[PDB]
Amino acid sequence: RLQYGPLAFVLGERTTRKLTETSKVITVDGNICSGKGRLAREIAEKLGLRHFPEAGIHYADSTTGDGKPLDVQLSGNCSLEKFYDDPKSNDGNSYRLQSWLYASRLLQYADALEHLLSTGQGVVLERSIYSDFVFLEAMYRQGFIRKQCVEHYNEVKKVTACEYLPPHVVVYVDVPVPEIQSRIQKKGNPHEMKITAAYLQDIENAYKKTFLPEMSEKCEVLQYSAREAEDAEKVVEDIEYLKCDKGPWPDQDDRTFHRLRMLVQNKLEVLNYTTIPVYLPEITIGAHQSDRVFQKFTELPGRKYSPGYNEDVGDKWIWLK
Amino acid sequence: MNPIIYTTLIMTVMSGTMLVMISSHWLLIWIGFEMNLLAMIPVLMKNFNPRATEAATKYFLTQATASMMLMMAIIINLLYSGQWTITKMFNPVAMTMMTMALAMKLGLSPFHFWVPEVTQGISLQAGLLLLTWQKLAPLSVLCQISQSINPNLMLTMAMLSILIGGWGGLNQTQLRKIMAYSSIAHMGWMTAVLPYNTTMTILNLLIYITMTLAMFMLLIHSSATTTLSLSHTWNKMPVITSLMMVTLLSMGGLPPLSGFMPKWMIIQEMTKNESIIMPTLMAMTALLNLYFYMRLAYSSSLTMFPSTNNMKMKWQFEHTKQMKLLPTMIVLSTLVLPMTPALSSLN
Amino acid sequence: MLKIIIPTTMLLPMTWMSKHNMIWINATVHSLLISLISLSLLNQLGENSLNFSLTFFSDSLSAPLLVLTTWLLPLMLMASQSHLSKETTTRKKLYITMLILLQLFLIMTFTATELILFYILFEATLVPTLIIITRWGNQTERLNAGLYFLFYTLAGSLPLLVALVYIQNTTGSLNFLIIHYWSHPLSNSWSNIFMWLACIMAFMVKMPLYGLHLWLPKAHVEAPIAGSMVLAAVLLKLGGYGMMRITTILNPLTNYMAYPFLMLSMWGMIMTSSICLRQTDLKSLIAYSSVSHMALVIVAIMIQTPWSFMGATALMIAHGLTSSMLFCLANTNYERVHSRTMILARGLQTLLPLMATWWLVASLTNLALPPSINLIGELFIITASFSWSNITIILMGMNMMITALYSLYMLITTQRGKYTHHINNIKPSFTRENALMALHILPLLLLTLNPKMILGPLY
Amino acid sequence: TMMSGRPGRVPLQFLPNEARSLPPPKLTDPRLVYMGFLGYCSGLIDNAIRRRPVVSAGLHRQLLYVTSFVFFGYYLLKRQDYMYALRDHDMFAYVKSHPEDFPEKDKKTYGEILEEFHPVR
Amino acid sequence: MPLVYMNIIMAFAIALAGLLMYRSHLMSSLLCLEGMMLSLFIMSTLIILNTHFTLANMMPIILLVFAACEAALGLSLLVMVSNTYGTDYVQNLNLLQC
Amino acid sequence: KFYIREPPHGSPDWLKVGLTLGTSVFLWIYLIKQHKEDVLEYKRRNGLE
Numbered sequence A: 001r002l003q004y005g006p007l008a009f010v011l012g013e014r015t016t017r018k019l020t021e022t023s024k025v026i027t028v029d030g031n032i033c034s035g036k037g038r039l040a041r042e043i044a045e046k047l048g049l050r051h052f053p054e055a056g057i058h059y060a061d062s063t064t065g066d067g068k069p070l071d072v073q074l075s076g077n078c079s080l081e082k083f084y085d086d087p088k089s090n091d092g093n094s095y096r097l098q099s100w101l102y103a104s105r106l107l108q109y110a111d112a113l114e115h116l117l118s119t120g121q122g123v124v125l126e127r128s129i130y131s132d133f134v135f136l137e138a139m140y141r142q143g144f145i146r147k148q149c150v151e152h153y154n155e156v157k158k159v160t161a162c163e164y165l166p167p168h169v170v171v172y173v174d175v176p177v178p179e180i181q182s183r184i185q186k187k188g189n190p191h192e193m194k195i196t197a198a199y200l201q202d203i204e205n206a207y208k209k210t211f212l213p214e215m216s217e218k219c220e221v222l223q224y225s226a227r228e229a230e231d232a233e234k235v236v237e238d239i240e241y242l243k244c245d246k247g248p249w250p251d252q253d254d255r256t257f258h259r260l261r262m263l264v265q266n267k268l269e270v271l272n273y274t275t276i277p278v279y280l281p282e283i284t285i286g287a288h289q290s291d292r293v294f295q296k297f298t299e300l301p302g303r304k305y306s307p308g309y310n311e312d313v314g315d316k317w318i319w320l321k
Numbered sequence B: 001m002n003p004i005i006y007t008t009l010i011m012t013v014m015s016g017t018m019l020v021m022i023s024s025h026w027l028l029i030w031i032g033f034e035m036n037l038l039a040m041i042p043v044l045m046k047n048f049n050p051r052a053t054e055a056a057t058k059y060f061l062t063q064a065t066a067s068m069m070l071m072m073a074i075i076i077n078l079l080y081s082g083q084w085t086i087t088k089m090f091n092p093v094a095m096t097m098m099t100m101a102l103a104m105k106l107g108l109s110p111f112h113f114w115v116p117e118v119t120q121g122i123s124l125q126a127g128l129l130l131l132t133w134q135k136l137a138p139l140s141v142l143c144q145i146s147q148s149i150n151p152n153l154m155l156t157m158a159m160l161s162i163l164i165g166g167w168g169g170l171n172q173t174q175l176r177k178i179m180a181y182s183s184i185a186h187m188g189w190m191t192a193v194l195p196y197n198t199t200m201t202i203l204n205l206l207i208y209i210t211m212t213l214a215m216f217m218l219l220i221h222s223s224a225t226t227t228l229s230l231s232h233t234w235n236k237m238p239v240i241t242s243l244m245m246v247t248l249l250s251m252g253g254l255p256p257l258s259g260f261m262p263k264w265m266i267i268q269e270m271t272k273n274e275s276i277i278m279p280t281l282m283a284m285t286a287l288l289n290l291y292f293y294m295r296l297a298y299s300s301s302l303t304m305f306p307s308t309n310n311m312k313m314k315w316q317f318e319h320t321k322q323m324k325l326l327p328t329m330i331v332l333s334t335l336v337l338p339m340t341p342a343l344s345s346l347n
Numbered sequence C: 001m002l003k004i005i006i007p008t009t010m011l012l013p014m015t016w017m018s019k020h021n022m023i024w025i026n027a028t029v030h031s032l033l034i035s036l037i038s039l040s041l042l043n044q045l046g047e048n049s050l051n052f053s054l055t056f057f058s059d060s061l062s063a064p065l066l067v068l069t070t071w072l073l074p075l076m077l078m079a080s081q082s083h084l085s086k087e088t089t090t091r092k093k094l095y096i097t098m099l100i101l102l103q104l105f106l107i108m109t110f111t112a113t114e115l116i117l118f119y120i121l122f123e124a125t126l127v128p129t130l131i132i133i134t135r136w137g138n139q140t141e142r143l144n145a146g147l148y149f150l151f152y153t154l155a156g157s158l159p160l161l162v163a164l165v166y167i168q169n170t171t172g173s174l175n176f177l178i179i180h181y182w183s184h185p186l187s188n189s190w191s192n193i194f195m196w197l198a199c200i201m202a203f204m205v206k207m208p209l210y211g212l213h214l215w216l217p218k219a220h221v222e223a224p225i226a227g228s229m230v231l232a233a234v235l236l237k238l239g240g241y242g243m244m245r246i247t248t249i250l251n252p253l254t255n256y257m258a259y260p261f262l263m264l265s266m267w268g269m270i271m272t273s274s275i276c277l278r279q280t281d282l283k284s285l286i287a288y289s290s291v292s293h294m295a296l297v298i299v300a301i302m303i304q305t306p307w308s309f310m311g312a313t314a315l316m317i318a319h320g321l322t323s324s325m326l327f328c329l330a331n332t333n334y335e336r337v338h339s340r341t342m343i344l345a346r347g348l349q350t351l352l353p354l355m356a357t358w359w360l361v362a363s364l365t366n367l368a369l370p371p372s373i374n375l376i377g378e379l380f381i382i383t384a385s386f387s388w389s390n391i392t393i394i395l396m397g398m399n400m401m402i403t404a405l406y407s408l409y410m411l412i413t414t415q416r417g418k419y420t421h422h423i424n425n426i427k428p429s430f431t432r433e434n435a436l437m438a439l440h441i442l443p444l445l446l447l448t449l450n451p452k453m454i455l456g457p458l459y
Numbered sequence D: 001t002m003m004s005g006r007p008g009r010v011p012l013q014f015l016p017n018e019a020r021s022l023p024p025p026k027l028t029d030p031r032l033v034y035m036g037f038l039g040y041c042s043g044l045i046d047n048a049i050r051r052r053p054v055v056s057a058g059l060h061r062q063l064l065y066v067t068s069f070v071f072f073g074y075y076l077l078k079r080q081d082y083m084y085a086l087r088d089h090d091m092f093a094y095v096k097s098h099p100e101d102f103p104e105k106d107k108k109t110y111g112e113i114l115e116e117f118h119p120v121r
Numbered sequence E: 001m002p003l004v005y006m007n008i009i010m011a012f013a014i015a016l017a018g019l020l021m022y023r024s025h026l027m028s029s030l031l032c033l034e035g036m037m038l039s040l041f042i043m044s045t046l047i048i049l050n051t052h053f054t055l056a057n058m059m060p061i062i063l064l065v066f067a068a069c070e071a072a073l074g075l076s077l078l079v080m081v082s083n084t085y086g087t088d089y090v091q092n093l094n095l096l097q098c
Numbered sequence F: 001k002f003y004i005r006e007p008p009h010g011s012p013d014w015l016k017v018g019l020t021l022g023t024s025v026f027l028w029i030y031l032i033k034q035h036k037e038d039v040l041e042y043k044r045r046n047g048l049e
């Protein structure tokens, strides 16, 4: 043992034995600038679950090396502020941002599943890979991205998200678009103040017409308004009194759980199909730029060698490690 | 598949091959072949998908036909001699049946199609085990029955294997199909030297196994199954591409790399027996194998193909699983030419 | 020979362990020291060779080639440090490693005492060269050039391997001394004809022979400066050395089998000089000049007289030095203007005086100007060919005239005339470039002073 | 199979008792040193693949690589030398026992041997 | 050799030709594969009974055992192919190419 | 502390280090003894010393 694998499995570590029937995956969803973050915080703290804030850019930075984020040129090469300012850029920033955000959400979902399977403690994600496509549809129907971008996104999403268990609970916070705009104006951030009304309507249409009907068949779906979402006590009470046996989690066994844990503990296999040789001009990076940026990344302080073997960050006994 | 079931199936495959290699009885040799095939099918079908199912179906059909022909040869040999011991076969018809059956098991031309088809169908681990072990066993049987092999038939099949491997590898783009055609060509070389020096056959087998293990494990490490997927490896782990380049150069037979030693020794041995046309043709035809190795090496290491944007996240993360004996295989497949006279120890 | 082999294998760890800014200094200094040490091999005997051990031996034919290789390494280092300024430290060290490996293989190739060890080493020299070309070349055609070079050489050399193992089975040994003492005449039969063809064709492709030479323009044009320097200076001399070695056992069949190769060499010498007359690319012009000179050397080896062998050796050394110098000069011009076209840059004599002097000296040596060793070798080959037949003088005279024509045409086009008006980035010549040209040219004149050191064993 | 099935051959025996009469390889053998070099190269490649400092990290692992390679190389050299000695022994015995097949020949000097001269001109 | 051995060998050859020439169904090929082992069983027992090789009488039973092991393997592969494609046709096994 | 997560190779596995050093030392001393025994047996069999 000493590391999960086939040896640990034949020794007898079993996920079903580890779980305590309170191990649930709960994902909170909503339109832009809703109370989903605070609702997720409340649910995670009341149920004793681990909270996962929405995976923006630099989530991979937060989970690797030191927690501090990296330069945007080295982590993402995309800008949400620039997307708000000039959505129809000529450098493909919109779809670069969308693909990077999908990869980050996939990585966060893998981390959450690994934590749940290795600990048995439930997790509350502020968004999942199953809700990421709504922003893609909003971009596409507004003309920000292209049909080729949509097709590449669909291919990667297929071959990646087909291998993971869906959330137990999907909590959707329904807020009207004018209220969304009023809250955005009150917040006062200029970049999100540049958001148009047609963009916000497309996200709501994608949630209502595709995501909620799709996830209603799998397991339980709970919808709340702003007032209902404000009172998190009733939401946690509703979660605690959910009866469901039609999900894939009951159908899972120890062998399937072993396979899933082996998949999710290996982050490079998680991201394996995120870099497929589909040469969209938006995401494709030339040989010279790739070489220069990779050289810079290796020149980063604790990135040249493996984590235990970086002398400049204060690792000793390297000659015996 | 449960880990215990997988390891017992692997143990059963190895037990079948060992039964083949230790048995002195034709019935026990056939039993070993049957046990190997029976335990090998689920290993192919481990990762369930229609391609794996089709590959396993084709593999089963081919190996079952070969086993039927081999048992027919055994019975015919028993009819004319009443002997069960595996020695020189006493009937030429039985010997021809046995030769064709073992060639079909090995994948020698014109019984080669199933090799690229199955290799493309199955995963990288399954292909590695297939190529290595399933070449290992029938070659042992052939070495035991070598003294009655029809040189004309054996050399015809070997030369066909070399030509077909070169041409198929020229056309292919998928890495698993490239490896399959490489295997076909190397089997051709081994069986070409087989009627003269079983020691040279064994030496070629060992060098080929080392090179194939190194190459397949590098492909598993980089998680590349196509040429373009391998073209992105320079941006994540550039050392793997350099090692793959030197291994590919070795597999093409370039001196002073390890892949030159089997070709050199086989040519020498064949020329000792007054064979010149066959060694010259065999040496010249390997240039096709070298061409598609070089074409694969241009994309992976010697040139920098465009990369994507999520390769940055891949940079941020580190490889977890450790390949067993990969550095040893890489060294043995490139730097053992000065240790050539150890083939006497192999004798 | 270990006192020269081991310091190269120590150049390897030193290069890999030195600091990021000391790699060029260390490599250059210790390469020069190794060259100085290898100068001691020129003290040869009049009777036999220097038999160091059972594995390595040195002769009057091997010694100058070894000295040329060891002297050529630091010049390649200087040119490489010119054009590889922005490379990473690991890739600089890999480049130096490829150069060091190539030098080690060449040294052991020239000093090998068995034909099979010679074959293994002279085929091992392909891998560093191919990697250098196809990895550090500038243009797109480097990949096709590497493929052409590799497959031409291997298609030539594989029948040589078969013939060598056959000869060992037949006679008992491939040791050069044994096969020289136990040589027997080769009867006129089809089997002997094809053995002769296998060996000779391997080395003729390596030479190259006219009609088997396209890989040479392809590879020399598209390789980096170090690759071009080593390809022309040394790697073309493996074919000549091999032919001067193997023809011991091919007599008397060489008297009858040399006609197609002699006719090909003479006519192709004329043809490649004429091609040089009408070349729009400077590197291609230099490459075809190399083809012409090596055709002359092939003629010398095939006629196979004591006066021709001395000429062959002298011409090989002289061509190595001259072609290396010409490639370096063309590369400096290319680094100025980032193009290989000959008529793009002109007036370089009024913009760069000392480089004009270097161009004049190199072009004068490229044509046979007395008393340079180029002329010594060419004159010996011409005299031996005249004793062979009396129309070879006609062909040689035509070749000399065209050689002078294209050499002076290249000089006049590049240097004289009026400067191109819009080319305003022609900075003054560097001390490094001037020192490189001086180190190319001064040893040639010293060899002219002492010519018995490069005339081979037949002297 | 030339030397397989040789009389008195114990199966599955890496080194028989009759090999103890040969000189063992010297520990400073060039072939043993090359085996050690291969082990060191394997250790360096292991460090490079695992992305540790190539020459610094894992000194114990590199030492184990070198030691294992030298151990197996020593035994391999012993077996190789024994097999070659066996081949020479068998060849000499056969030549001794078949004089009609390997007859001594009268040696003629080059003064008595006639060889054709082919001029080069 | 008597004509009986000729008939048995001819039957084996007919069954071998049947297997190598597919028509549409994979099941028919499996039936041809089972017939080959029946002919092998008959031939081996005819040879053994005639020479009174007493200890060899157990060989045909082992032959039958591995025969039905192969039949089991083929039936399992056939059910997987049928589940994937809807029919046991050999034309559907064409995803992989040479 | 620099890494947000403890690296798997944070501190040397002293069990593995001890096993590695012990295995190397055992193999070396065994090889020396084997070579000495081989030399003695060779000399005894050939009647040299």
Ligand SMILES: CCCCCCCCCCCCCCCCCC(=O)OC[C@H](COP(=O)([O-])OCC(O)COP(=O)([O-])OC[C@@H](COC(=O)CCCCCCCCCCCCCCCCC)OC(=O)CCCCCCCCCCCCCCCCC)OC(=O)CCCCCCCCCCCCCCCCC
Residues within 6 Å of the ligand: B238, B239, B242, B243, B245, B246, B256, B301, B302, B330, B331, B334, B335, C012, C013, C016, C017, C090, C091, C094, C097, C101, C127, C128, C131, C135, D040, D041, D044, D045, D048, D052, D053, D054, D055, D056
């Ligand atoms: C040293 C001479 C060797 C001669 C040949 C012998 C056989 C090979 C040697 C054994 C293996 C060595 C290690 C291989 C991996 C190295 C990776 C690396 O970065 O290394 C840098 C490493 C130091 O860097 P670091 O800070 O640790 O980490 C930097 C990162 O790795 C930086 O990582 P990165 O991400 O920047 O890496 C990117 C780089 C990564 O590139 C590489 O990793 C290239 C090197 C590995 C490629 C495969 C190596 C050969 C494997 C066997 C194949 C056959 C070899 C023979 C082939 C002959 C025909 C060519 O990729 C590229 O640059 C791609 C573009 C180029 C691709 C095309 C060219 C490929 C050439 C392949 C053949 C090279 C053969 C010569 C060996 C060159 C390396 C030593 O330096 C060395 O390992 C130097 C060698 C060891 C020196 C030991 C000195 C001990 C003390 C003194 C002893 C004195 C003598 C003893 C007697 C006592 C006297 C008193």
Ligand SMILES: CCCCCCCCCCCCCCCCC[C@@H](O)O[C@H](CO[C@H](O)CCCCCCCCCCCCCCC)COP(=O)(O)OCC[N+](C)(C)C
Residues within 6 Å of the ligand: B203, B206, B336, B339, B340, B341, B342, B343, B345, B346, B347, D004, D010, D011, D012, D013, D014, D015, D076
């Ligand atoms: C009192 C009791 C004491 C007992 C002491 C032990 C006695 C020996 C026990 C051996 C181990 C037990 C059996 C386990 C398997 C044994 C395998 C090996 O020992 O057997 C030998 C086999 O040894 C190996 O063949 C030699 C291995 C050589 C490895 C290198 C190959 C050379 C490659 C060339 C380049 C080398 C590059 C450098 C390599 C690192 C000889 O067996 P043999 O019955 O006769 O083989 C029959 C088959 N033949 C006839 C066709 C050959």
Ligand SMILES: CCCCCCCCCCCCCCCCCC(=O)OC[C@H](COP(=O)(O)OCCN)OC(=O)CCCCCCCCCCCCCCCCC
Residues within 6 Å of the ligand: B323, B324, B325, B326, B328, D046, D061, D064, D065, D068, D069, D072, F016, F018, F019, F020, F021, F023
């Ligand atoms: C006959 C045995 C064959 C090998 C069996 C074991 C194979 C699996 C183990 C090696 C896996 C790859 C190497 C890298 C391991 C990285 C993990 C690590 O830290 O390993 C530490 C380990 C030393 O730990 P330790 O448990 O002490 O090992 C000795 C046994 N007590 O350090 C190591 O393991 C590194 C050194 C391993 C030994 C040298 C490499 C193997 C080759 C030995 C010489 C034979 C060469 C020819 C091989 C083919 C022909 C037999």
Ligand SMILES: Nc1ncnc2c1ncn2[C@@H]1O[C@H](COP(=O)(O)OP(=O)(O)O)[C@@H](O)[C@H]1O
Residues within 6 Å of the ligand: A031, A032, A033, A034, A035, A037, A054, A056, A080, A097, A098, A101, A132, A135, A136, A192
């Ligand atoms: N797939 C996506 N594409 C583009 N922008 C996204 C995507 N996912 C999230 N975002 C941006 O990230 C931010 C998420 O925060 P938000 O949903 O507003 O909650 P809060 O109100 O707590 O900030 C929003 O500004 C949104 O525009």
